[PDB]
Amino acid sequence: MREVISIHVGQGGIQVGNACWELFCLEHGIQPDGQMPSDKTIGGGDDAFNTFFSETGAGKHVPRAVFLDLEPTVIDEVRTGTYRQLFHPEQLISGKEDAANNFARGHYTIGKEIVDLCLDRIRKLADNCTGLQGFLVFNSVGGGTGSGLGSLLLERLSVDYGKKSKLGFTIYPSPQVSTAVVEPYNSILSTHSLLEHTDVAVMLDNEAIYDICRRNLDIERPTYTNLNRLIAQVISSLTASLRFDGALNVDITEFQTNLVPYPRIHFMLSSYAPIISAEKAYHEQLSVAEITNSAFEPANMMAKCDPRHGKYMACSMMYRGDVVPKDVNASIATIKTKRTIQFVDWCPTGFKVGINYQPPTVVPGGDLAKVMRAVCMISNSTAIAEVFSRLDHKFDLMYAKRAFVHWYVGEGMEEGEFSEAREDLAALEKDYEEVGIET
Amino acid sequence: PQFSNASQIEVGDRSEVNHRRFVSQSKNVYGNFGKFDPVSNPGILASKTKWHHHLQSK
Amino acid sequence: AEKYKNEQEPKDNTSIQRSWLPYKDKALQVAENNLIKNQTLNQTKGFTPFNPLITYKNNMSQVQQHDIATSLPIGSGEHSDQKRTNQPGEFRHVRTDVTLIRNKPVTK
Amino acid sequence: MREIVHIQGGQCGNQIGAKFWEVISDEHGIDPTGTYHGDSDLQLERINVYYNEATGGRYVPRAILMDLEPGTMDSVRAGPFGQLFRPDNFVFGQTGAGNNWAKGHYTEGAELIDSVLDVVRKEAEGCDCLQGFQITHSLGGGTGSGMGTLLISKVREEYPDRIMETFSVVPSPKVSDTVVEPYNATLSVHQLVENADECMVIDNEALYDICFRTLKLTTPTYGDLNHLVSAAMSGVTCCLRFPGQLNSDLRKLAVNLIPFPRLHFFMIGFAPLTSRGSQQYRALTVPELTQQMFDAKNMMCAADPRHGRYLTASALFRGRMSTKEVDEQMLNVQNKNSSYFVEWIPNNIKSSICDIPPKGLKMAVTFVGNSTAIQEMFKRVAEQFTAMFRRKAFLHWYTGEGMDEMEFTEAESNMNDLVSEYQQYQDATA
Amino acid sequence: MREIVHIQGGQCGNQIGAKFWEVISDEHGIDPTGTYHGDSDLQLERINVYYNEATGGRYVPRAILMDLEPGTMDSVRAGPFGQLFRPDNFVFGQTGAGNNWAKGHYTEGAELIDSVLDVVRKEAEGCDCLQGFQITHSLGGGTGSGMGTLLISKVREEYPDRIMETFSVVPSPKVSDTVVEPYNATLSVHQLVENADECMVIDNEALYDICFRTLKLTTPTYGDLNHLVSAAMSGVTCCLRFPGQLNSDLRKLAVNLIPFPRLHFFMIGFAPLTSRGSQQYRALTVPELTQQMFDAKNMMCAADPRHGRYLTASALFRGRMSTKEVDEQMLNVQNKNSSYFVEWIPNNIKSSICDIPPKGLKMAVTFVGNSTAIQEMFKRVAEQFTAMFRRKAFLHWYTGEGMDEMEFTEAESNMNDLVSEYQQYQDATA
Amino acid sequence: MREIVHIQGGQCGNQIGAKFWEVISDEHGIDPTGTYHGDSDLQLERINVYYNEATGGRYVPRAILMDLEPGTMDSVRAGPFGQLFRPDNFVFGQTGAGNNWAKGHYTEGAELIDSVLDVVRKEAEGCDCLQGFQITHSLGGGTGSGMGTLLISKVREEYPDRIMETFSVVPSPKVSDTVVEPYNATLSVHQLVENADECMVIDNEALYDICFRTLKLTTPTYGDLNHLVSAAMSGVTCCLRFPGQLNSDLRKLAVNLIPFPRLHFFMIGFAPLTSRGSQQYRALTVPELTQQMFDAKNMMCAADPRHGRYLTASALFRGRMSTKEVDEQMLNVQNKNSSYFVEWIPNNIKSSICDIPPKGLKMAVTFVGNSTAIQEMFKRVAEQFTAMFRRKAFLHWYTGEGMDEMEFTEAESNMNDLVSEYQQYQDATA
Ligand SMILES: Nc1nc2c(ncn2[C@@H]2O[C@H](COP(=O)(O)OP(=O)(O)OP(=O)(O)O)[C@@H](O)[C@H]2O)c(=O)[nH]1
Ligand SMILES: Nc1nc2c(ncn2[C@@H]2O[C@H](COP(=O)(O)OP(=O)(O)O)[C@@H](O)[C@H]2O)c(=O)[nH]1
Ligand SMILES: Nc1nc2c(ncn2[C@@H]2O[C@H](COP(=O)(O)OP(=O)(O)O)[C@@H](O)[C@H]2O)c(=O)[nH]1
Ligand SMILES: Nc1nc2c(ncn2[C@@H]2O[C@H](COP(=O)(O)OP(=O)(O)O)[C@@H](O)[C@H]2O)c(=O)[nH]1
Ligand SMILES: [Mg+2]
Ligand SMILES: [Mg+2]
């Protein structure tokens, strides 16, 4: 009876969900076509799969998700792929003209003719539900189309539904390797868009995942499909507790009350471990003591930020597998007693411990090995300032020469908006510094 | 940097409310002369004599 | 404090070497039956661990599976008697009839 | 005849109740389906204390289970002994507390108490002569403490002459289980002291600590934790249910364990408890038990009694034993340890004798003593609280559901006042 | 009544204690599998001297097992008759002594001795009327010299009335097992004389000499050596377990043997002992046993009496016998060897008899020696100590763990002082 | 009545007096403003020993601050309790001493020492009858040792009947501060030996060792070290300000510690000093006070007293407690360790009891004793100095300020005699 609705927008968002739904598909045994393969399924109290899938009255299931993009090639790719029969035919809305890396295009000119349909479809999904908990939004910040349709859909959410809890996994371009040359502009403009309209967001800059993948799986040449699977892992973790039997439980609504100390500071970076390939897999113990340490290690950060420069604010821990309470109690005991990681003077206890029982599954033909102990971490630390400043620099330099500004004035967006956004980013940097000082 | 002495040994444990802290035993031991009615049963004096010492000890 | 080398040779019998005491030393005889009795118990289960030694630490204790009326009957532990498989969907919810509401009553 | 209705709420509440019934179930010898299979007559004579009557001779517990989220209740129904509770007493929400007190005490908690408050009154009136209540909940948890405290508050306003009890679990700063624990833990007691006649504090840290160095089992689980508390819960009512030399009802413990109306916190401990490997290497005589009851280690309370200075305490023995060594020893331990007891309360220990031991032994001890050391928890609970308040950290959540800053400070003053009294009633001489 | 305690530490202590407990179990009738299979009712009459009672009629020995290395505890437990010992009596660390005294009395022991004291105190207070303590340890080793002695000081300070027993295997210059043997042993004598009331040294090299000559066994092993000592101290405590014509207790032994407080060093022996060749060719009468008792090679210490003079010596006979023969033989040995007994004390030999001898022999004799020959033993070790210390060889280990050379110099001075004060009486005349 | 005066020479005198006047104020209860906020009447009974009365009831500590450095002097004024000193007593030079003795004793200091003489004399008549001078300075520093001693030299000139006392902090070998260390410490004793009636040397390392071992504080600061002495200073005169069983003014201590006129150096130590994490248990009963008092580790002087013999002992029990243990334990300790006590002074330990111990305790004792150990302190310093002379390095500064080779030689012979004359009586026999 507990259900959620997922929202992915933009080409990058389109594919990332593809990997996540492949994992979600295998977790509950749904066949690729949409029919139960066991053929032994019984009724009564077996509808624990309502969290993501929904019965269709007769036969298959539909994934309660919506795909929105302005460029047809990516969307059509899923339509004619092996997963054709799964999705609802009309829930994969597609556009005609691409935004073309112009944030103005995706939020004032072409975007306003596609958001109308998107809200309608979400209306159909929610009504079917009964205990709607919240949404999950994935977007690619470093693009004009991703930000505009990605952003504008968010504001419409702020007014039609209201207080429903909502989360977003944004992807800010990397500090030193990035595709778009106009990435800084729409990135900063986005920073305003989600700052006071989203409750929580996690940083997943792609550079780190290459770093994490290179140092664990031994693979030198990952592709964008590889990166997708790991993110599909974190999403499964953050929501797993909601849908399986456990001794200690945390729900989606629980996170918003133990990770955001103030409304303004609503950014946090996640980490994952262990990630051990098949080769290296066996020759360890995967003991809780060694696993818990790896999570805090800087080498595993999924956002290119080093917690050491600054202090921590609040950390949430979700375990899965056959972990036991003593194993956790000692681990947190060890971490605090160390000196390399230190906390602020106003957070005496800041750990939220969760425990599940269903072990994570291994995707076919993937890279993650099959293990029993795992840790999914979402930590909000004052150090996150590094992401904005590095982006902070890149935006100002263009404006001083007023380079490329003219295609941003070619769709009607006022020249003053850029001035407004720059001020808000300055405020956010101010706040991050202030919280970390001593009493 | 805590300037000056910044002495922090705290030799005394502190927080001990010794209400008899500054009472010179030269005073009480000679001049209590309290209660101890003119009772004749030796035990009755015995107990009342038994108590006076404890209060003096504490 | 010694190695129980049991052989014919009079210089390595121990038994033939520890009878100078006043009486029949209570030590060798009790030790012997231990080796014999353990073998029979192993045959009941079957271990053949290349020697009776690898089976000579944990086949003599008397800690019974149940208490002797000196402590709470908490047992050996919940995790001790736990059997676990590791297939998908093993630990899914059941949604018992207690909370299995279907009609959502409207009037109070 | 003095039947007590047992109510517990919260996830931490469910498990304690989920298994505690197991211990009481085995004592009177009731099977899973509700059919009696007793061996003696006594075990069924005084059975009205916890069980009602039903057709077919099956007995159903007079329990009220309360929670705001579906996960906790459903699981307890699936396990063994889960068929005893009647479906009527069940009451549950559809939203979730979210580890926020106010969401469990003003908005979500309020809009459901009408249903729950209705069932509780039905049970009370059903009894011939209500003798008291008994509540187990979590102060650091949301649904437990969230609306758990409020129900207790209202109940007092309706049944003034009855006796109230509580088994509260408050987080210790050793093992943290919720970032916001200091808030909901610190402000709950304020509504607790003014309404709870008796409170018994048991901290999970002590329960975990007792496991390694008493029982010596390599890997403990939550199942082990519940059982230890389950028996101790029986100790308070041990003599009330079976015949004995010197009966002692629930109030009788209140009369001899409350020096003042504002000091109603104790600590409970259970003896004997010897490790598996030491199952047969011990003597079940009075001398052995007495050492375990008063030892600083055995108490399930985070506060060490030895730093403290006892005011009053009670002992609830079980099983057939003589009266010399129950009485004579009580004199010896007190006399040889007079340096740690009040000097203006003579004969400050209560002794009771009941002659039906727990299933599987021949002697048991249930101790519930009030030592000035219990101040230790409050000082540390508040101490961490103050660090979290000077910055208004995490305070925005609590101001979005109708509460104002006035309650927070006013509650803080009440706690600090409670801390002061304990010290005052110790550093004084006749 | 008149019950005692046993504390064994270090590898040698554990070995000797295990052998002694095996022998005592044999004598009293205790089986590994603990139940009673003894025949004579006399055995169970006073079995409480060295044993308690437990639920199920299973006897437990009031021993204490302790050490800083895990193997020794693990090894004795694995072997038969080590399963009688109380696991709760097991206390140990995970570091190891490594033949360093300071490691055994200052740094590590202080952290772990806290637990040990509690166990000993509780066990001792449990019994009704104590009689003393008999401790087994080693002075040439690392753990034994330090951990036990520290225990000795604390126990003596706590309980200033009950007497104590000690069994020390001092090293000798014939066979050596450590290159630093003199230091830890020499410092041992400095602290032990002031507290240990009774001490009965034991010398290994005498063991091999006695093993090779009288026994004539071709290949002896540790089991052979440990076995003898068990006999000696089992016989020293014979009258206190069995009736007799003239009971003599521990306090009786000390009072008749120690003239002055500083002279409390003894040497012991055992009889009868016969080589496997000539077992059945000799009888069992007071004459033969008394003749073998005073022999130079029958003693149990490296000291040779014939170069010294006895001050006081007591004989604890076992089994039936004709008393007049006992008295007559003692005087005859006294008169025919007046040169070996000092003059200013008349009747410097004691006697005692008990009604039950060890299983498997008609009678046996246990002898305790207090003669000036013990001066040589200390002198030789003093010779080694000075040579090792002049160059300060190996001194850096002990200087680097908080010890000071002032303590070493004080100990070296003390040993010479005792040697002189004890050798004085040999030339002193009335 | 029977009052003294304070003369602090230099920062060491500045800080040592900086804290001591801070520590004392609490003992007699004086606020930062000099306003009384005490509780009992006795606290003002003898507050006149160190304080003078003025209009407005404010009290005034009668101290005079002397030094040649303005950077340090003013620092105390800005700090708390630095305003207890009247500005009038502020006397100071303008150039400093430059760690060179001569610049502080013949050319510069002699030029300005006149003014302090007037104030020091002025303070004398203010009191009823002067009792003595206790002066804290530094021998290892120039300014204190340069013009300080000259202050001590003439003070006794005008009052040949009043006695004077000194705290001295002498250079130690492990950690050095000044390269003029051999000179300033060496010659300076020449004037102090013939001038000061009582000298109580104190060594800085011992604080580290005392703070590192018993205090266990990870990081001491000069403030922490200053405190250790501050209590120490209060121990000598403690019985001078309140009632007592056997009040012992500075006179009695003087007549009970000096065997002969030339030996006026003492070694002291304070205790108990519990660790930072001292658990609340038991009480500092008399038995433990004696043991920690005589520990060689607690002594403040670098020379270990066990290297020689004690000439006599003086103890000052603090708090309310009977003297029988004072009579016995003071007697008991002497017998056990009589190997370190000289012969021809039978009963060579003094006893004193006071009823006003330091705040936050129940009992305590301050140790003052003179033992031949200090021979090592002057000896090793002698070797350092002797190597300096023929070396003839760093003498040009000392030869360039009005003095020549004759002055240096005379002191060395004086101290060479002092070391010898200190050792002659060490080996003397009765
Ligand atoms: N992690 C991850 N990021 C991707 C992947 N594919 C694209 N991206 C992100 O997408 C960014 C480029 O913009 P896109 O989102 O791909 O393109 P778009 O949003 O459709 O914008 P337009 O091209 O104008 O339509 C890159 O910086 C990547 O960070 C992927 O497979 N994995
Ligand atoms: N000892 C013990 N503690 C428990 C158990 N279940 C829950 N808890 C405690 O309850 C706390 C979490 O309570 P929570 O579920 O948030 O309470 P709720 O929000 O009212 O449902 C944790 O800190 C645990 O310490 C249990 O079975 N044993
Ligand atoms: N007679 C005898 N002596 C032993 C035996 N085992 C060890 N020793 C002696 O004990 C000494 C070693 O002491 P040790 O156990 O290492 O002391 P520790 O390091 O403090 O435990 C050696 O010099 C041996 O002579 C034994 O079985 N019999
Ligand atoms: N115990 C102690 N000794 C100190 C302190 N400050 C300085 N000293 C000692 O004083 C000596 C040097 O004195 P100095 O600085 O020349 O005094 P000044 O010239 O008058 O300032 C050093 O050897 C230190 O050991 C302190 O706070 N405590
Ligand atoms: Mg695109
Ligand atoms: Mg006088």
Quote the DSSP letter at residue A52: T
> Nominal resolution in Å?
4.1
CB burial readout E231-260, b (16+ within 10 A) else e = bbbbbbbbbbbbebeeebbbebbbebbbee
Q: Is residue D318 part of a domain?
A: yes
Pocket of ligand 4 (CB under 6 A): F 10-12, 15, 67, 69, 72, 99, 138, 140-144, 169, 171, 177, 204, 222, 225-226
Q: Count CB neighbours of F179 within 10 A.
A: 11
Q: Are residues F209 and F284 in the same domain?
A: no
Neighbours of F72 (CB within 10 A): 18
**Coil, helix or strand for E145?**
helix
Of all ligands present, the nearest one to the C-alpha of E223 is 3
Atom of ligand 1 nearest to the CA of A225: 31
Which residue matches tokens 């693009």?
Answer: A143
F304 and F183 within one domain: no
Domain co-membership, D278 together with D344: yes
On whether both E91 and E184 belong to a single domain, the answer is yes
DSSP calls for F387-428:
HHHHHT-S-HHHHTTT--HHHHHHHHHHHHHHHHHHHHTTS-
Q: Which of A133, A200, A349, A351 to mutate to test the interface with D (most CBs of D within 10 A)?
A: A349
CB A329 within 8 A of CB D175: yes
How far away is chain C from the Cα of A193, in angstroms, using its nearest Cα?
Answer: 39
Which chain E residues have a beta carbon less than 8 Å from that of C20?
Answer: 215, 217, 273-276
**Distance between CA atoms of residues A354 and A374, nearest Å:** 12
CA-closest candidate to residue D338, choices D300, D377, D310, D372: D310
Q: Does E204 map to a domain?
A: yes
Tokens of D170: 């408050």
Terminal CA-CA length for chain A: 46
Sheet containing E63-67: which strands, arranged edge to edge? E90-92, E63-67, E3-9, E130-137, E163-170, E199-203, E265-271, E364-371, E310-318, E349-350
Burial label, E166 (beta-carbon count in 10 A; 0-12, 13-18, 19+) = buried
- Is A191 in contact with A421 (CB distance < 8 Å)? yes
One domain, residues E63 and E127: yes
Please report where in the chains the tokens 């034993």 appear, as a residue.
D321
Q: How far is the CA of E368 from the centre of ligand 3 (A)?
A: 23
Helix ranges (DSSP H) in E129-268: 143, 149-158, 181-192, 204-210, 222-236, 250-257
- Location of structure tokens 């580890």: D99
User: Could you say which DSSP state residue E25 is in?
Assistant: H
CB contact under 8 A, B17 and D427: yes
Q: How close, in Å, is residue D278 to chain E by CA atoms?
A: 7
- Closest residue on chain D to E56 (Cα): D280
Cis peptide before F272 (omega within 30 of 0): yes
Q: Is F100 annotated as a binding residue?
A: no
From E81, which residue of chain C is nearest by alpha-carbon distance?
Answer: C27
User: By alpha-carbon position, which residue is closest to atom 24 of ligand 4?
Assistant: F177
> What CA–CA distance (Å, rounded) separates D327 from D323?
6
Distance CA A218, CA A189 (A): 37
Question: F103, F105, F138: which to mutate for ligand 4, most atoms within 8 A of CB?
Answer: F138
Q: Verify that F109 and F216 share a domain, yes or no.
A: yes
DSSP E39-66: --HHHHHSGGGSB---TTS---B-EEEE
The residue in chain E having the minimum alpha-carbon distance to the alpha carbon of residue D216 is: E88
Do F245 and F275 share a domain, yes or no? no
Whether chain B lies against chain C with 3 or more Cβ pairs closer than 8 A is no
Q: Do B58 and D427 lie within an 8 Å CB cutoff?
A: no
Q: Is A196 a catalytic residue?
A: no
CATH of residue D349:
3.30.1330.20
Whose tokens are 């947190």? That residue is A332
Asked if the structure places residue F385 within a domain, the reply is no
The number of domains in chain F is 2
C-chain CB neighbours of D361 within 8 Å are 69-72
Size of the D and E interface in Cβ pairs below 8 Å? 25
User: Are E292 and E226 in the same domain?
Assistant: no
C-alpha–C-alpha distance, residues E228 and F66, integer Å? 79
Domain boundary among D224, D256, D288: D256
> Which site among D273, D276, D281, D336 would you substitute to test the E interface, given the most E Cβ atoms closer than 10 Å to its Cβ?
D281
Which candidate in A254, A290, A386, A411 is catalytic?
A: A254
Q: Is D393 within 8 Å of A347 when comparing Cβ atoms?
A: yes
* Rounded distance from Cα E126 to ligand 5 centre (Å): 84
Angle between helices E149-158 and E109-126 (to 10 degrees): 50
Overall residue count recorded for chain F in this entry: 430
Note whether D197 and D282 are same-domain residues.
Answer: no
Torsion of CA A143, A145, A150, A152, to 10 degrees: 120
3-state secondary structure of E132: strand
CATH number for the domain spanning D128: value is 3.40.50.1440
Experimentally, the structure was elucidated by: cryo-EM
In angstroms, the CA A246 to CA A257 distance is 21
The answer as to whether E163 is a domain residue is yes
C-alpha of residue E47 to centroid of ligand 4, in Å: 71
Q: Give residue D38's domain range.
A: 3-256
Out of E8, E11, E208, give the residue to mutate to test ligand 3, the one with the largest number of ligand atoms within 8 Å of its CB.
E11
Ligand 4: distance of its center to the CA of F12 in Å? 5
Residue stretches of the annotated binding site of A for Mg(2+):
71
Structure tokens at D43: 């075990």
Binding-site residues, ligand 3, Cβ < 6 A: C 1; E 10-12, 15, 97, 99, 138, 140-144, 169, 171, 177-178, 204, 207, 222, 225-226
Beta strand F63-66 with F3-9 is parallel
Q: Are residues D324 and D343 in the same domain?
A: yes
Q: How much is the CA Rg of chain C, to the nearest whole Å?
A: 29
What domains lie within chain A, and their CATH numbers?
Answer: 3-267 (3.40.50.1440), 268-386 (3.30.1330.20)
Q: Which atom of ligand 3 is nearest to the CA of E104?
A: 20
- For residue F249, being part of any structural domain is answered with yes
Interchain contact, A329 vs D178, CB within 8 Å: no
- Which of A314, A303, A327 lies closest to A384 in space, CA to CA? A303
End position of a domain, from candidates E215, E235, E256: E256
Question: Residue A257 is which amino acid?
Answer: T
What is the CA(F18)–ligand 4 centre distance, in A? 13
> Considering the domain boundaries, does residue D388 fall inside one?
no
Distance from CA of E120 to the nearest CA of C (A): 22
**Distance (Å, rounded) from C-alpha F185 to C-alpha E291?**
75
What tokens appear for A337 in the block? 């007693």
Q: Strand ranges (DSSP E) for F122-197?
A: 130-138, 163-170
Q: In which residue are the tokens 């003390």 written?
A: E414
Is residue E275 less than 8 Å (CB to CB) from chain C?
yes
Determine the Cα–Cα distance for residues B3 and F223; give it in Å rounded to an integer: 9
Long-range Cβ contact pairs of E31-35 (< 8 A, separation 24 or more): E32/C30, E32/E80, E32/E81, E32/E83, E32/E84, E33/C60, E33/C62, E33/E83, E34/E58, E34/E59, E34/E60, E34/E84
Phi-psi region of E166 (alpha: psi -120 to 50; beta: other; left: phi over 0): beta
Rounded to an integer, what is the distance from CA F296 to the centroid of its chain? 19
Q: Does residue D113 fall inside a structural domain?
A: yes
Find chains touching chain E: ≥3 CB pairs under 8 Å. C, D, F
C84-97 residues labelled b (16+ CB within 10 A) or e (exposed): eeeeeeebbbebbe
- For residue F219, CA distances in Å to B4, E400, F8, F208 come to 15, 22, 27, 10
Looking at the CA of residue A11, tell me the nearest atom of ligand 1: 20
Ligand 1 centroid to Cα of residue A95, in Å, is: 17
The CA distance from E203 to E302, in Å, is 6
**DSSP 8-state symbol, A390:** H
Select from E328, E353, E374 the last residue of a domain: E374
Q: Widest CA span of chain C, in angstroms?
A: 99
Q: Which of residues 220-239 of D touch A (CB under 8 A)?
A: 220-222
Nearest to A322 among C84, C95, C96 (CB): C84
The SS3 call for residue A270 is strand
* Residue type, position F182, single letter: P
What CA–CA distance (Å, rounded) separates A177 from A408?
24
Does the N-terminal peptide bond of residue D272 adopt cis geometry, omega within 30 degrees of 0?
yes
Q: Are residues D299 and D249 in the same domain?
A: no
Of E201, E204, E231, E200, the residue nearest E220 (C-alpha): E204
Same domain, yes or no, for D237 and D280?
no
The closest alpha carbon to F375, from F428, F424, F412, F410, belongs to F424
Q: Give domain status of residue E40, yes or no.
A: yes
Burial class (CB in 10 A: 0-12, 13-18, 19+), D111: exposed
Atom of ligand 4 at shortest range from CA of F67: 20
Mutation for testing the C interface, residue in D14, D24, D227, D279 having most C CBs under 10 Å? D279
- CA-to-CA dists, residue F56 to A195, F53, F59, angstroms: 64, 9, 9
Query: What burial class does residue A278 get, using C-beta atoms within 10 Å of its C-beta: 0-12 exposed, 13-18 middle, 19+ buried?
Result: middle
Chains contacting F with at least 3 CB pairs below 8 Å?
Answer: B, E
What does the alpha-carbon distance between residue E327 and residue E322 come to, in Å, rounded to a whole number?
9
Asked whether the CA dihedral F115, F116, F121, F124 is positive or negative, the reply is positive
